[PDB]
Design a protein around this nucleic acid. Structure first.
Ligand SMILES: [Zn+2]
Lengths: 99, 78, 204, 60, 154, 128
RNA sequence: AGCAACGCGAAGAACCUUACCAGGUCUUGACAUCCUUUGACCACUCUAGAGAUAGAGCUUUCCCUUCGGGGACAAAGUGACAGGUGGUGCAUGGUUGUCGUCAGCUCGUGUCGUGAGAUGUUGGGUUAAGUCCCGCAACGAGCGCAACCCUUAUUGUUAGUUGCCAUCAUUUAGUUGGGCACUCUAGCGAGACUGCCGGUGACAAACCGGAGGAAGGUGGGGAUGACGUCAAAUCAUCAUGCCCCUUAUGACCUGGGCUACACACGUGCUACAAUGGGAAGUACAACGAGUCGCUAGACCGCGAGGUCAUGCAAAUCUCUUAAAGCUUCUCUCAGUUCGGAUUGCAGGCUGCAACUCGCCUGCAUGAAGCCGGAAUCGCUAGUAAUCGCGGAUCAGCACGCCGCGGUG
């Protein structure tokens, strides 16, 4: 509703931590923030041969999960915009605010 | 399947246009085995490099849609 | 070849990535920039005994932190060397960089430090049997549940290669909640290359 | 010859279908992943050490 | 195996006739896991049985089974470098196993234009002491009760 | 009205079943169970809980099913119908319990391993 | 290069890749540092050439100034030097295969032995297990085994959008009003322990049976591979000791092999039909991928495809109405309405360009093959057998590889 967040990360611990940060500092100055809704956690898969020259019949498999989290804000106020676009922690987590 | 106009090379077509006037020479020596045999190549004698040498091929009329590489093989069996 | 890398078996379980940034559609460039960075700063490391390096990055700045055992001999007199580190790293990354230097405590309980030090004796014509023994002796006195070392190659600067190491205390490898450390270095005396490996168990 | 070929790989190609990928640490031309720009067995080497962010060993 | 005997693989009695024997017969006709085809085949065959000179498909099927199943099978064994064959008894599950197996095998080789025209016809010929299935049983009984010679003290 | 709801799972298929007094009938995904699963006789697998306990009518059954194949999402329907019947009267948890009809079948598709043709089938071998 | 080489390095040979061959070319050099003159280098256009290159045209042009310097760079000089997929896996590091996920390998204090050494770690039972019990000059301990990690089988709670629609109106419809009940998604917790009940057995460990429960005896599957063996494999991923080349074993370009064919061996796909072939109708999944990419829809073409155009950086849109299945109508046991090799003609798509040497379409042709000797292989349950779908690599190119689910 005319303001909403999106957060991607590789660790759900950091993800939930920052989601609680934003939810708390949002409902401190406003009201009615839709919960941190979870999204379905994309996954990839990489198979590789673990030997430099021969032996195709023995491999090692890797992956990279990407956790997702959604937060929608209802009825912002000329102070929520301020108190939201300023908090920034932590480092390796993607934030994308679309109106 | 180049239904957007068949394919010659500029050097090859330049040479053939240049000799189009009079009776022709056997010295048209090009590598160019990708080119097709336009209906103006008749009567000449093209030299087609086969990876080792320059084979001459005399262009009759029945050979008018094929390529210049179809008349100079490369493998040498028996 | 029948053992897994002990700090790749445990990454994403009890330890973290030494590179913590999230990016998409700018991922190859970032990974090779980190590689360039880390392959460069092995310049001062040649003397200052650095162990790890942690790369984070923001909108256009790059936050770096390095763990060393020589704080003054890496920052300068009054701050005249970190200046150079930043003004040199800007020439590569073309961004703003901010080194935040950490200092390491108990440096004898670190795999890269120990192994790299006991792989510098081999170059100075020292016998290997007592290098490893004194290494594990000065690693146990700092207080450690177990340690294991191993050297390989043409020993004594001699003919056909062999291998041998020494163990002290327990070093359980199959336990996933173990917090072990590991590193692999190289050196030469005059013949070929040697490989030194070191594992230290520091509780969980 | 593997120092002239890395040079010849980085100059602009003579035709569209003449460019090809190589590894960036080494110059291996076979089996490179084009999300990382790393070959078959630098991937397995930098996945350990936890340098590539994301990637880890998979089991299910 | 080596450790010791194993279980018996419980079966699920089919719901039409509520008879585990029809279940095993469906399982033996089926090839490649296409079970609905096998079920259609068995049901068309039983329809053909009852419609033409029949009383009930279970009755004539049981009697055909009774007339085909064997009671004396032999086993060719090795001792120390010379091999022979000796008769032995036959436990119950093996009996119905062999019965079903022979009936299906020798209906599959009939030579008409439908598996039903083969199966119904063959188990009718079987419930009247006829058909290569009964002859296979009697070949077995004749091999036994003769090769008891080099079996009398085995 | 009164109604009874249960949830049934089998082999990548999940069903949401509703019991409602009536005259004995079942419709699934706005179609008739004679047409939705018209295979041969899987319906006689579905109507088994009514056959063993609460014998035997009369409830109209309305179900919402999605996932798996035609034979998985009928064992799932059976699972759900049984759970719903349990909900009606708890005294049924013995007759149903005796005849299976109350447990989830945890027989899923085994995963493929590398170096093998399938989950367990290996390549062809030659001693020489 | 037996098991442990032979759909293996190669997860993509038309040019490139490319190391090989034939012709055309260069020598401080395709790539790096230094020192000096110094210093801002270009790109673009036109003739000759198969190109590599050479010859001419607007010009590579101070971005720090205290008048005094430093960054990028072409040429030259200038030689230190570079360069090698050249040799040695029997000089090496590192990284793998196999015995084999088999159950083993050692120490401290005692005791025994003149001594090297032994005991423990032997014996009975049991166990998947050097896993446990009983006995015993032994008593304890370490790495191995098992546990801690992942996924699947049941559920409580927190959160309802892009997911869902049970109680309501509405339309083509979950769509729009409404709701978060149900399914689902994903964080945090519960639950399985021989934990109770009966028998066997040295009362012991353990085994057999029952109750309850979604699940019962390491519930199912993965990751995890000890001390060691084969001078096993790899100087061609990368490094590196010694040896070798240096106007050539280095380097640039076009065209040709790597795809050649009297044959022999391995791994696969399609069939030899009626449990089938053909025509019409009706259904049911899961894992994954997408920005110069995935293409909705409408139209043109018998078809592969083409044109105009639409949504989506994604639980929102698309790839994607799965195929076996079910229901009708045929065909009648035949080298055939089975089979689809080979050849003729005409097209499409990517690409500067499909002759050697690509994939696909249509019409025409219609081979061997009627279940395969000696011998030999895979597999113990959602497994074998059978059926499709996705993606890494990649302009294009898969019967191979990695995963997913359906019937069973
Ligand atoms: Zn690489």
């Amino acid at each position: 509703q005319k303001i909403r967040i999106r957060l991607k990360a590789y660790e759900h611990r950091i993800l939930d931590q920052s989601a609680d940060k934003i939810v708390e500092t949002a409902k401190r100055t406003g009201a009615d923030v839709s919960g941190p809704i979870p999204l379905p956690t994309e996954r990839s898969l990489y198979t590789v041969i673990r030997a430099t020259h021969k032996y195709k019949d023995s491999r090692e498999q890797f992956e990279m999960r990407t956790h997702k989290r959604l937060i929608d804000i209802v009825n912002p106020t000329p102070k929520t915009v301020d108190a939201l676009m300023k908090l920034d922690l932590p480092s390796g987590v993607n934030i994308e605010i679309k109106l | 399947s180049l239904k957007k106009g068949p394919f010659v090379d500029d050097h090859l077509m330049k040479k053939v246009e240049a000799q189009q006037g009079a009776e022709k020479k056997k010295v048209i020596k090009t590598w160019s085995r990708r080119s097709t045999i336009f209906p103006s190549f008749v009567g000449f004698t093209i030299a087609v490099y086969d990876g080792r040498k320059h084979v001459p091929v005399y262009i009759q009329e029945d050979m008018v849609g094929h390529k210049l590489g179809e008349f100079a093989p490369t493998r040498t069996y028996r | 070849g029948q053992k897994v890398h002990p700090i790749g078996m445990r990454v994403g379980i009890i330890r973290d990535w030494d590179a913590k940034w999230y990016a998409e559609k700018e991922y190859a460039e970032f990974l090779h920039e980190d590689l360039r960075i880390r392959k460069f700063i092995a310049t001062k490391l040649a003397d200052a005994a650095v162990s790890t390096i942690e790369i984070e990055r923001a909108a256009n700045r790059v936050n770096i932190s390095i763990h060393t055992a020589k704080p003054g001999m890496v920052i300068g007199k009054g701050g005249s060397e970190v200046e150079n580190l930043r003004k040199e790293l800007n020439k590569l990354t073309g961004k703003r960089v901010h080194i935040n230097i950490v200092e390491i405590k108990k440096p004898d309980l670190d795999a890269k430090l120990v192994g790299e030090g006991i792989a510098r004796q081999l170059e100075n014509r020292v016998a290997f049997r007592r290098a490893q023994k004194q290494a594990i002796q000065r690693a146990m006195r700092a207080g450690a549940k177990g340690i294991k070392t191993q050297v390989s190659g043409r020993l004594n600067g001699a003919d056909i290669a062999r291998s041998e190491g020494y163990s002290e205390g327990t070093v359980p490898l199959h336990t996933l909640r173990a917090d072990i450390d590991y590193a692999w270095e190289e050196a030469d005396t005059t013949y070929g290359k040697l490989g030194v490996k070191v594992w230290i168990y520091r509780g969980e | 010859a593997k120092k002239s070929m890395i040079a010849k790989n980085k100059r602009p190609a003579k035709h569209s279908t003449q460019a090809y990928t190589r590894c960036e640490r080494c110059g291996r031309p076979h089996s490179v992943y084009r999300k990382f720009h790393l070959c078959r067995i630098c991937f397995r080497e930098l996945a350990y050490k936890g340098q590539i962010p994301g990637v880890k060993k998979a089991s299910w | 195996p080596r450790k010791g005997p194993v279980a018996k693989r419980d079966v699920l009695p089919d719901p039409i006739y509520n008879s585990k024997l029809v279940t095993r017969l469906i399982n033996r006709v089926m090839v490649d896991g296409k079970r609905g085809i096998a079920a259609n085949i068995i049901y068309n065959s039983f329809d053909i049985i009852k419609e033409s000179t029949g009383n009930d498909p279970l009755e004539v099927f049981e009697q055909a089974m009774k007339n085909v199943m064997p009671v004396l099978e032999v086993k060719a064994r090795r001792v120390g470098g010379s091999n022979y064959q000796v008769p032995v008894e036959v436990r119950p599950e093996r009996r119905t196993t062999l019965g079903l197996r022979w009936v299906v095998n020798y209906a599959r080789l009939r030579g008409e234009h439908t598996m039903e025209e083969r199966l119904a016809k063959e188990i009718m010929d079987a419930a009247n002491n006829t058909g290569a299935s009964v002859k296979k049983r009697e070949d077995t009984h004749k091999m036994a009760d003769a090769n008891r010679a080099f079996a009398h003290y085995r | 009205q009164v109604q009874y709801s249960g949830t049934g799972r089998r082999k990548n298929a999940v069903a949401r079943v509703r019991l409602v007094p009536g005259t004995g009938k079942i419709t699934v995904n706005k179609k008739d169970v004679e047409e939705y699963i018209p295979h041969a006789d899987l319906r006689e697998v579905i109507n088994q809980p009514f056959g063993v306990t609460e014998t035997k009518g009369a409830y109209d059954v309305i179900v919402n099913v999605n996932g798996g194949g035609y034979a998985g999402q009928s064992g799932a329907i059976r699972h759900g119908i049984a759970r719903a019947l349990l909900q009606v009267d708890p005294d049924f948890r013995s007759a149903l319990k005796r005849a299976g009809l109350l447990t989830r079948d945890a027989r899923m598709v085994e995963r493929k391993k590398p170096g093998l043709k399938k989950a367990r089938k290996a390549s062809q071998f030659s001693k020489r």
